[PDB]
Amino acid sequence: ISPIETVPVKLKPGMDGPKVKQWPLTEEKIKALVEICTEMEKEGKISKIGPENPYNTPVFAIKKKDSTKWRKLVDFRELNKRTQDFWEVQLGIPHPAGLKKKKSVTVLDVGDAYFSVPLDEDFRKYTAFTIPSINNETPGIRYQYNVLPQGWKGSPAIFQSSMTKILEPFAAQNPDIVIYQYMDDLYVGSDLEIGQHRTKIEELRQHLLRWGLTTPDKKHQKEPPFLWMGYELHPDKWTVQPIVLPEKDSWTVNDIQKLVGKLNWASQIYPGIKVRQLSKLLRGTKALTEVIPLTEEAELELAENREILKEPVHGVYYDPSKDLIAEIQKQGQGQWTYQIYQEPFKNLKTGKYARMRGAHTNDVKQLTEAVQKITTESIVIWGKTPKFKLPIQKETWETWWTEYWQATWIPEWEFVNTPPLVKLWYQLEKEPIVGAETFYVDGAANRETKLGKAGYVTNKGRQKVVPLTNTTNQKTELQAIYLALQDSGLEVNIVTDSQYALGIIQAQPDKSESELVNQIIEQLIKKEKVYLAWVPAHNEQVDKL
């Protein structure tokens, strides 16, 4: 316990406290339980009140740290379900690339933290538990908690705000030293002459101890580099704790999930990691442990990642005096790579963007999406936005955004001449073309018959119809346009009654997960001038039915 001010905790509106069964357990367990229980009553963590309390929560006794020392713990489920909500314990973690080099860093893990914070008095009656002697044929003893019980709903957040309040006085007396908080740890940084930093660490330790919170009195901090939340934090660099990529013959769903996870985790500091073909496999079905054979593309991606990974790479820490740069490169199949740095020799961090949605995608729209994702990330990590280095020409961009149907904001950015440059590969005409043949295209299919036709009729009197198997109304609508393109000169006007086809083509896509649309793309790139116009049905549409 401690003279800390408790936080008031009420139960959920109109709820009663737990009144749960206590089935007797092994006699050995009961013995060890009474031993540790009366030992922590002596320390004021729990008291013993028998008569009037009608509440009860079950206790269990196990041995996970077999120090000839059992462990009591309480299933606080039914109580947790009945206690109010709290301020959400901090969701997320600080990324190392937003940390600033401090001349010295100490880590302090607070011992038995929750048990050292008092619990609001009028709530303690709701933590009562019982110990039976002989199959309940002889009564038992009943206790309750005076402190934050292990794994209760309010324990972590109440602990956090108690800790913050205990820190405030020391922080006021020590503006030059910096203390970040995490579940049980303090991370204390300073730019003081090392002797002063050590004296300050002992001052903070004695402060905490006088507030009831113990701290490692040894050569305390597991020294740098620090193994923190899957990270190596080195005095002047950070990286990820090494990632072992297993070599196996067969692969389960769970194992591919673990592999894709380790790879994306690695991708924040290892440049060039791809996961497209790895995760394409899991995206297939919702099977939980089905044996998925590895594919050819997935295996080359795994080889390339394995070759990136067996060599060490690190990141630098943030310096607010030196500005912030983000640079973007394309890879292929809607995969993009990027780096955040302040100097071009060492990165603050790296990352990948994947066009997830949209089967009819565009290189420039994707690049925009990547600039957006980076911008959000930088607002989170550093509190400002990068200056961007982008493989796109200014005329290209100014042309795209001015004609695009959405509104799109483009921060301060500088063109970089590194291939593969990002361009637009074709542009439809704004008005029909004089002296160019006009193709009235249309196509049709049957839902149940699954056969279809696609054709065109031209002003020169040219007509074609082509049959197709296992196609849809939409696929033949695009096939009719593809026919018009195939059979036309370098300037062609095309007329379709398919608003879906007009929508697809007018989206100026660069690649698709659809062979037909890629062939239309290659045709449109090949053509010199193409005006595409739309009309409704009910022309040549009736002849291809």
Ligand X SMILES: N#Cc1cc(Cl)cc(Oc2ccc(OS(=O)(=O)F)cc2OCCn2ccc(=O)[nH]c2=O)c1
Residues contributing to the annotated binding site for Mg(2+): 109, 184-185, 442, 477, 497, 543
Per residue in 271-300, is it b (16+ CB within 10 Å) or e — as a string? bebbbbbbbebbeeeeeeeeebebeeebee
**Ranges of H-type helices in 329-472:** 363-381, 394-403
State which residue, 58 or 94, has the beta carbon closest to ligand X. Answer: 94
State which residue, 55 or 231, has the beta carbon closest to ligand X. Answer: 231
Which DSSP category does 538 fall into?
Answer: -
Q: Should residue 224 be labelled a site residue for ligand X when binding is judged by CB under 6 A?
A: yes
Rounded Cα distance, 339 and 159, in Å: 38
- Backbone dihedral region for residue 298 (phi beyond 0: left; psi -120 to 50: alpha; all else: beta): alpha
Enumerate residues 6+ apart whose C-beta is below 8 A from 125.
17, 53, 55, 144
Q: According to CB under 8 A, which residues from 36 to 95 bind other proteins?
A: 84-88, 90-95
Q: Which of 37, 107, 354, 520 binds ligand X (CB under 6 A)?
A: 107
The nearest distance, CB 185 to ligand X, in angstroms, is 7
Stretch of residues binding ligand X (CB under 6 A), selected from 224-232, 306-314, 466-474, 535-543: 224-232
User: Sign (positive/negative) of CA torsion 97, 100, 104, 105?
Assistant: negative
State which residue, 187 or 353, has the beta carbon closest to ligand X. Answer: 187
Q: According to CB under 6 A, which residues from 349 to 368 bind ligand X?
A: none
The dihedral formed by the CA atoms of 151, 153, 156 and 158, expressed in degrees to the nearest 10: -130
- Distances in whole angstroms, Cα of residue 99 to Cα of each of 102, 144, 186, 319, 528: 9, 43, 15, 8, 53
Binding marks (x or -) toward ligand X, 389..418, rule CB under 6 A?
------------------------------
The nearest distance, CB 100 to ligand X, in angstroms, is 4
Q: Binding site membership: which residues?
A: 109, 184-185, 442, 477, 497, 543
Rounded Cα distance, 452 and 466, in Å: 9
The nearest distance, CB 410 to other proteins, in angstroms, is 8
Stretch of residues binding ligand X (CB under 6 A), selected from 221-229, 319-327, 351-359, 450-458: 221-229
Q: According to CB under 8 A, which residues from 395 to 414 bind other proteins?
A: 401-403, 405-410
Paired with 335 in beta bridges are 354
Q: Which of 15, 356, 525, 535 binds other proteins (CB under 8 A)?
A: 535
Q: According to CB under 8 A, which residues from 163 to 192 bind other proteins?
A: 164, 180-181
For ligand X (CB under 6 A), the number of binding residues is 17
φ, ψ of residue 39 to 5 degrees: the values are -70, -40
Largest Cα–Cα separation, the chain: 106
| Token reading at 487 | 């059979």
Identify what 233 binds: other proteins, ligand X, none; CB under 5 to 8 Å per kind: ligand X
Specify whether the CB–CB gap between 416 and 500 falls below 8 A.
no
Q: Should residue 220 be labelled a site residue for ligand X when binding is judged by CB under 6 A?
A: no
Q: According to CB under 6 A, which residues from 87 to 106 bind ligand X?
A: 94, 99-102, 105
In this structure, the number of other CB atoms found within 10 A of the CB of residue 409 comes to 9
Stretch of residues binding other proteins (CB under 8 A), selected from 38-46, 71-79, 141-149, 432-440: 432-440
Q: Which of 143, 145, 211, 317 binds ligand X (CB under 6 A)?
A: 317
Binding marks (x or -) toward other proteins, 503..532, rule CB under 8 A?
x--xx-----------------------x-
